Amino acid sequence: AKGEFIRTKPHVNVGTIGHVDHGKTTLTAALTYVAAAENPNVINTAHVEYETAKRHYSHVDCPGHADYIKNMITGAAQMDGAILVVSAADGPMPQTREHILLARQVGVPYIVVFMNKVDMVDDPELLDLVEMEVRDLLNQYEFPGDEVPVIRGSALLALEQMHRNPKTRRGENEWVDKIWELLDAIDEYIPTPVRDVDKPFLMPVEDVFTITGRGTVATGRIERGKVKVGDEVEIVGLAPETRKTVVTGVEMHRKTLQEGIAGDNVGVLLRGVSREEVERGQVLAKPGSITPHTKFEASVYVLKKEEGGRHTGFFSGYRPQFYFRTTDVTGVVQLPPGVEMVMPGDNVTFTVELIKPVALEEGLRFAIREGGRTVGAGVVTKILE
Amino acid sequence: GRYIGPVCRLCRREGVKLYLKGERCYSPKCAMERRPYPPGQHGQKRARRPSDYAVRLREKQKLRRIYGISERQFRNLFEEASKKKGVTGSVFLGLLESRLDNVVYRLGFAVSRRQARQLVRHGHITVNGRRVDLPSYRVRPGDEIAVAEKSRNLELIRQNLEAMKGRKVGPWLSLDVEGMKGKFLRLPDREDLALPVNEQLVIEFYSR
Amino acid sequence: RNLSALKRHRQSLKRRLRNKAKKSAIKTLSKKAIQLAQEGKAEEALKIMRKAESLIDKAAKGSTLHKNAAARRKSRLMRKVRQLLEAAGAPLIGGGLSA
Amino acid sequence: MVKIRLARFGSKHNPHYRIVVTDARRKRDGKYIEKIGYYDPRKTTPDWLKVDVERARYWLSVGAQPTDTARRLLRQAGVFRQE
Amino acid sequence: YIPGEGHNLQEHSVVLIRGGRVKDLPGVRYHIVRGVYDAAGVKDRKKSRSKYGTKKPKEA
RNA sequence: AGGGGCGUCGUUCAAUUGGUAGAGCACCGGUCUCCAAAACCGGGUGUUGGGAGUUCGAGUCUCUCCGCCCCUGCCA
RNA sequence: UGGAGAGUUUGAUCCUGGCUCAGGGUGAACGCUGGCGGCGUGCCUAAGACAUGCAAGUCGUGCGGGCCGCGGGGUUUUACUCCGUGGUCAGCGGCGGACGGGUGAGUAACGCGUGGGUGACCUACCCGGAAGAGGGGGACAACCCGGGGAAACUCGGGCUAAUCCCCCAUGUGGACCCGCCCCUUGGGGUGUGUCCAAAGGGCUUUGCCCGCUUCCGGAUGGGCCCGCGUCCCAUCAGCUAGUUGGUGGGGUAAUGGCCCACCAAGGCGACGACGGGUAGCCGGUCUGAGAGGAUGGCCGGCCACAGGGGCACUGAGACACGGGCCCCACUCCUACGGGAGGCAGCAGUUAGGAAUCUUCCGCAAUGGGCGCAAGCCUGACGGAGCGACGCCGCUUGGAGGAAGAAGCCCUUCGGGGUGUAAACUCCUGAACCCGGGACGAAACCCCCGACGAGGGGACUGACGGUACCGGGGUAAUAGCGCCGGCCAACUCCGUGCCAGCAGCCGCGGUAAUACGGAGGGCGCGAGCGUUACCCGGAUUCACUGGGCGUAAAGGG
């Protein structure tokens, strides 16, 4: 009454971006209900899976829209690629622009644009004016815009056919065939990164559930190494002192997994751990590895106006919000003697006094935001405290 | 665990020069030999008349530091001494002596008590054949204490077994300097044990 | 989901029915007999009563009247009858009762 | 019915039984009717087993089914041996 | 009562009470354990720490 | 995780006329005193919750954080 | 074989008297700190609610079949599938699911403790003795077929087997009525009448093994009754109608108003009735010189309970934890007419809480149920896991080594202390690496002897490649409390009735062994402190062992 889970194809995390009211949140409930015909057993971000015939997928569909930045910004990192959704009717709007910029701020290599809402206002230029301004803004943002697998089709329609009867093979609807175009032109172009199973386990915590009868489960994509039932771990970051327990369950998309490794959004059931004892931001690492820290230094690079950043500079005693992993903390800033007035465009090395103990570590990278705008990036140097 | 730290410090504080080092703390500098006055930034001033308490505490810490024992261990022995028929003063000392790390010392083998422990604890010692690594082991009447085989060659067992040339043991313990044995003939006695300690004063410490 | 204790219940009902019936009988016969013991039917009284006394020890054979719960039912019968006949009757047919 | 089994005494990894005439239904280490001996499975002691003569035989002469591994000891103590 | 010198307890902090009155405060009949919940330890406290919360500082 | 509120000397309360921050106690020094109280002299003692944003300047108008109250969120 | 006191009312005293402290203890919790092992021990709160899995089954030597693999085709083929056949799925029949395991809600009561009574009774399987096991009939499942249903299941028709059911007989005997004798509450004998038994199954077959029937007795386990003992409030004083007794019935294994008719008016209470509160009781446990006081967690005995409540059925036994019915509350499924379900079983979740564990390994051992047996089932149990929660053992090094480094802190500028401590020098070698490696296990069983006694043989170990043993082998953890007095341990700075301490007395208002830090010391040590609660001290409810002229206390 659980259903096991075996691996055969290489795993890969994805997600969908775009503008609120366009397509994304709907083509996801389209791509999933499609690869469920020729494959057995298939406000808040819903992580829904769908497997093809070449690779296993995760897919993080962020609700999008403003206000939901902090919740969007997270999953952005967890994905190897993003399906930039654009509507035929409208076009490149603030969200479609905002999501792409933030899509760059948070790593994320390669982009696969999909033209949805095609089944609206037929126009020679329209369908070929959108495919233009896309690469115009994508490249205005240093993306491979001039060589991005842009597909075309209507999701709203493509799905209504599958709801009549589950099974609907290749090109038997023409519309549910354009879903096989992007779903095909996706396992292509966007490759697979280096998943090192050699580094001491460590996975950030996104959401934390309390699965009845079993205990507290901490979801999140593993960042390195591996974990199976019986392995001890540590809850580093936030809370009085770093907890230590044992993993007694590892599952891949509600179906019993065996051994998770870097690259899979796998949920882990932690041995006797109240649900208040675990929260966002914390990391599950191999015992002894990594520790909780407040003060640190970093080769922070303060952006400039022409790239969204500030344009007035801050002083020693500035309180911005840093995003190390799936979280966001705030901190005071007191840099070395002099070196005052760190206006836009600097590689200064100041010191931060976060109010919440986060899993720091020399080498680990972060970012800075303040006033709803990426003020800068960086990477920890010498961990003071 | 059994203290471990500046020991001639006690040699002093108790005012009755102790033998926790065996050699030096037996030579012209047991520390006492240069400072018969308690340690500390003070240790040498108008010692206020000791309270009836102080007196008994000190007369107890003395007798216990002599054996290195811990308070838990020490107090247990005392309690055991009581319930047993016969003067608790004697008996206590008796049992206190039947200790192994002690009978190791009360027979040569080790220069000190703190040494006689690391000895038994490291195997080197032996009872009726089979060996023991537990100090707390209480030797009975009729049990010889031999050294180990892999021991009779070590640098230490040498010198220690050397001084045994001539020197004698209490009327309650025999010894074969070569056969490295020695039988626990009988439980010692208040007398035999010429210890700088008034037991009845300690017996009284464990009252109120 | 379930157990073979059920077997034990099915039987439960059967046996229940079995002596549930044997009892009704003895009760009916016992009453019918005494109901004559005062009418004077001394002859057919000791006749029925002699029969009742049968099903009694009879049921006693199994788990019906378990034990001497029968012996009691009996004495209360051939005592209720006897003490009804001497109300002008004299023991005709030599039934259970003995003079 | 009334049996003649073993009741476990002695702490962990130090089993020491008590040969007793308990009641079939009792708990292994519950109230027994009458102890008639003990048994040491590690033999640690030149008396690893001892049993009451006239007694064992008594309870047998009144229907007391001895356990198998129990009977083994009754015998090893020569209870049935009629000479 | 709130021990040590200097606390971080505001109108909605959650503390963990224990027995112990304070002879001068007519109403105070309990003490607030330190280093448990909303109540932090005592800063710098190097002396009696077991009491007052504050963890053993590494001489560093 | 997402809505909405409150937060100003140490405190209880103002400036909804955007023009450095205003009142009573509380308290602080000066005189008296061993030290206080009282008495007479004289005092604004301010993380406008934080930090940034517009502005010639913001308690006020924009954000983003902090703590708290509240209303919904939340089974690998 | 056993008894310690101190601080605090005064300017001072003696007395009275309260408060407080030093001791011991705990299913503990909180703080700081934390290395190993052994034996213990771990929801004290919501008797709150619970996903999932497992906790009770077994017998073909009781019986008939379905079905599959197969002697070899029954007839001659694949016809009657007969039979041989070890299995397997239910069914029928039997024994066990009433014990083992959990909890303490309820209960102040013959519940428990203790000693007794039963001429007022029961007891499956187990022992010993007595006599039997002769005839016959019959049904309902399974199966076949028809039917309704979402499901859970259910209905009709018809086969058939038994150790299932029923009738007659034999009556060793037993039951019952009346009589008699003995005896004395209903027990024992006897006579007439009446009524009552039973099953065959397997072999190695006129005999054994396992059953069956009736009776007497032994065992063990129980029911009922009785004397004495069992908390607080009397600001609770009167209580009672099935009430108290009787006669006759019903009822039960059996006494009894247990229940019911009818008759009588009783029964109970300051020796505390009734009522309210609280509570499971005991062996024991902690404390105490003792007498006492407190307590009832783990272990053992008894009782009560099984979501809340009522009730029967089956049965030797239950008004039944993992059986049944019904009402209610909650969970779940539903094709909305009806369905399934109860962790106070073992693990685990959640809620509440200051707080209490792994969804483990094994039936090897012990014990249990069923079996001729093999053997099967067994979250009882034997073990492992997590938590210093407790106790016990062990470690963090032993020996050297300066009129005594540095740093730090004092200083009457000589010096003193931390300090033999270190550094440093020999040194044994926690760990760990390598090899070896258990006891717990000897019978059921096989064989000679008769499956008797006795003799011999074989399989079997979860914990474990763990304990332990040999060899190799690195110096390798320290903290916490406290230093006015009680009470072991003193000095500098800061501070200035502030900040703070505080068990009691009381410390802080500019020289503070009492605050904070520092150095120094004392206590104990993988621990050390704190809070909570019990006993002690408290002869401060005084039996042991006090008091009342004026301290509280003589009643007008």
Ligand SMILES: C/C=C\C=C\[C@@H]1O[C@](O)([C@H](CC)C(=O)NC/C=C/C=C(\C)[C@@H](OC)[C@@H](C)[C@@H]2O[C@H](/C=C/C=C/C=C(\C)C(=O)c3c(O)cc[nH]c3=O)[C@H](O)[C@@H]2O)[C@H](O)[C@H](O)C1(C)C
């Ligand atoms: C930023 C939020 C969270 C970041 C989290 C972490 O970031 C990271 O630390 C990351 C590591 C590099 C990081 O530090 N990110 C932190 C930052 C990284 C920044 C990198 C790279 C850049 O280079 C300067 C890069 C985008 C660069 O900018 C250019 C953009 C120009 C934009 C002009 C704006 C235009 C027209 C505009 O209309 C516009 C707008 O849309 C919004 C606001 N206002 C505007 O005016 C161009 O597109 C280039 O490509 C890791 O990825 C971590 O793993 C992480 C994901 C947890």
Ligand SMILES: Nc1nc2c(ncn2[C@@H]2O[C@H](COP(=O)(O)OP(=O)(O)O)[C@@H](O)[C@H]2O)c(=O)[nH]1
């Ligand atoms: N006209 C049209 N509407 C569509 C299409 N796809 C989705 N929609 C509808 O647009 C509305 C918002 O779609 P949704 O996917 O939730 O937008 P997102 O959440 O911003 O991606 C819903 O009614 C969708 O069904 C399309 O292809 N054409």
Ligand SMILES: [Zn+2]
């Ligand atoms: Zn010395």
